Amino acid sequence: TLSFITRWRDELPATYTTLSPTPLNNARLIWHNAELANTLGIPSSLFKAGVWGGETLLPGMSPLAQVYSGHQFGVWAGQLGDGRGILLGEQRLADGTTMDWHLKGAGLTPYSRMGDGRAVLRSTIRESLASEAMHYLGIPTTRALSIVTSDSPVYRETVEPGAMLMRVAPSHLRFGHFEHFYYRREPEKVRQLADFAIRHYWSHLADDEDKYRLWFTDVVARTASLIAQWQTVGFAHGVMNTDNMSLLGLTLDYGPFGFLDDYEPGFICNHSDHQGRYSFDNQPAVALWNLQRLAQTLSPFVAVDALNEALDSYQQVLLTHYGQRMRQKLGFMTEQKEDNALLNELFSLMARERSDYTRTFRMLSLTEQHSAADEFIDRAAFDDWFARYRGRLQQDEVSDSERQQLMQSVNPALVLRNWLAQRAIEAAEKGDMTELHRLHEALRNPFSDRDDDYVSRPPD
Numbered sequence: 001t002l003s004f005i006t007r008w009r010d011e012l013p014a015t016y017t018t019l020s021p022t023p024l025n026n027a028r029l030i031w032h033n034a035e036l037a038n039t040l041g042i043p044s045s046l047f048k049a050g051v052w053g054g055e056t057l058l059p060g061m062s063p064l065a066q067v068y069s070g071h072q073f074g075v076w077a078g079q080l081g082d083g084r085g086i087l088l089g090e091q092r093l094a095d096g097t098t099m100d101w102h103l104k105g106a107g108l109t110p111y112s113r114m115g116d117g118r119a120v121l122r123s124t125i126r127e128s129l130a131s132e133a134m135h136y137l138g139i140p141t142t143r144a145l146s147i148v149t150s151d152s153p154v155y156r157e158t159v160e161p162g163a164m165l166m167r168v169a170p171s172h173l174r175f176g177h178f179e180h181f182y183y184r185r186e187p188e189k190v191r192q193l194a195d196f197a198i199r200h201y202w203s204h205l206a207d208d209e210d211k212y213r214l215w216f217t218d219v220v221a222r223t224a225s226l227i228a229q230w231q232t233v234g235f236a237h238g239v240m241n242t243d244n245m246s247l248l249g250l251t252l253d254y255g256p257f258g259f260l261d262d263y264e265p266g267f268i269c270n271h272s273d274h275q276g277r278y279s280f281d282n283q284p285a286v287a288l289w290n291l292q293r294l295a296q297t298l299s300p301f302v303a304v305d306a307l308n309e310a311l312d313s314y315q316q317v318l319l320t321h322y323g324q325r326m327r328q329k330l331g332f333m334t335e336q337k338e339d340n341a342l343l344n345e346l347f348s349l350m351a352r353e354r355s356d357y358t359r360t361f362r363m364l365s366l367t368e369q370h371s372a373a374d375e376f377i378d379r380a381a382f383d384d385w386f387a388r389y390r391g392r393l394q395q396d397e398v399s400d401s402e403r404q405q406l407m408q409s410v411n412p413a414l415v416l417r418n419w420l421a422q423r424a425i426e427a428a429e430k431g432d433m434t435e436l437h438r439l440h441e442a443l444r445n446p447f448s449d450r451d452d453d454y455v456s457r458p459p460d
């Protein structure tokens with residue numbers, strides 16, 4: 001009843017190795033995304049480890065591990081690849097889409113290098129939670145379909161349970177795919193990848209008419225738009241290597257990510273990021289550097305000037321998405337020239353007071369235009385800003401009522417803070433999945449107001 005195709009396998013030879021998953025010991029399904037499975041047409045009976053732990057294949061699957069390369073922390077790292085995941089197959093849906101089924105943690109691969117080919121329970125739970133949270137925030141992302149755990153030992157800093165995440169995504173094409181064949185001096189493979197991407201994901205681009213220029217221009221636009229969205233909700237990726245940049249502009253590879261709590265422009269959650277290369281505030285600059293590295297691979301067949309003209313549009317596109325989203329976050333229904341100084345004043349104020357990001361904007365969503373109605377060390381400086389802020393809201397013509405309603409639709413009540421995920425991971429390891437299911441449910445309504453500790457500070 002499910003339709004899989006062998007598109008990547010048939011059309012992109014020599015980009016992969018065919019292999020099957022390596023099952024874990026006593027693997028069992030612990031969580032599956034019931035909403036997504038209905039969207040995908042998956043029979044519910046399939047969840048009663050099977051395919052979710054790589055122990056069986058569904059008809060039409062032809063599993064393979066893709067090769068790719070990357071710049072890691074700004075330095076060429078050579079060949080990477082699907083070192084601990086398997087593309088099981090590509091599913092065609094009724095709307096004409098294809099969805100990759102990628103099993104993360106499926107075992108050793110020719111691209112595992114010196115790693116064990118496994119994932120652990122805590123990292124797969126964090127990835128599932130964050131990817132689902134990002135989707136309900138309206139931010140392009142890979143999706144999480146299932147998690148299996150096992151009694152198989154996997155060693156990181158402690159001994160942990162081996163686990164697998166079934167990831168689904170429209171594509172796993174990364175900037176690092178193009179780099180891989182460019183620095184192998186195989187410029188025709190690079191063009192083949194670009195042609196494959198345009199044929200399946202940009203099919204309105206009529207063949208040859210400025211094909212690659214308009215395509216790359218749009219690739220720049222989607223990555224600028226993704227970063228703008230991260231910035232407004234306080235998402236720090238942590239590992240923006242070129243092999244983790246989705247060509248389509250989806251959030252990809254959830255490792256040492258972090259949703260901002262205290263507002264900290266130079267916030268770093270990657271423990272190995274010594275220089276803060278992937279600090280929250282460098283994400284705009286880093287994404288542009290990643291696009292420049294992609295632009296280098298395309299120069300064999302795209303005029304180097306049209307490449308730089310696409311790269312020059314990055315800042316305006318990022319600024320437009322960012323500015324429009326923040327103005328909704330600030331309740332600015334029109335556009336006054338007081339708006340930039342007002343925001344810059346708030347952020348510099350928020351950074352000196354270490355205000356909680358999500359809470360600051362959610363509380364600001366209760367603002368009444370004519371009312372001046374204590375989380376700051378310098379209340380005098382807030383009332384001064386809050387007054388000049390409120391005077392600008394008066395110009396907006398619009399009511400108190402549904403200015404607050406617009407703000408509550410763009411300022412989340414709940415985000416996935418590190419301590420919420422950790423609580424679900426702890427209970428999960430003890431064999432209690434209630435907190436993991438509870439947290440998943442809450443994250444499907446990030447803009448609803450809450451009674452419980454899902455909107456609170458980390459206890460500390």
Ligand SMILES: Nc1ncnc2c1ncn2[C@@H]1O[C@H](COP(=O)(O)O)[C@@H](O)[C@H]1O
Binds near residue numbers: 081
């Ligand atoms: N436990 C593991 N075993 C084998 N390969 C891994 C493991 N963890 C990560 N890798 C691979 O190492 C690379 C790290 O990429 P990054 O996400 O940029 O840090 C990717 O190619 C991964 O597939």
Ligand SMILES: [Mg+2]
Binds near residue numbers: 243244253
């Ligand atoms: Mg990765």
Ligand SMILES: [Mg+2]
Binds near residue numbers: 239253254255
């Ligand atoms: Mg990773």
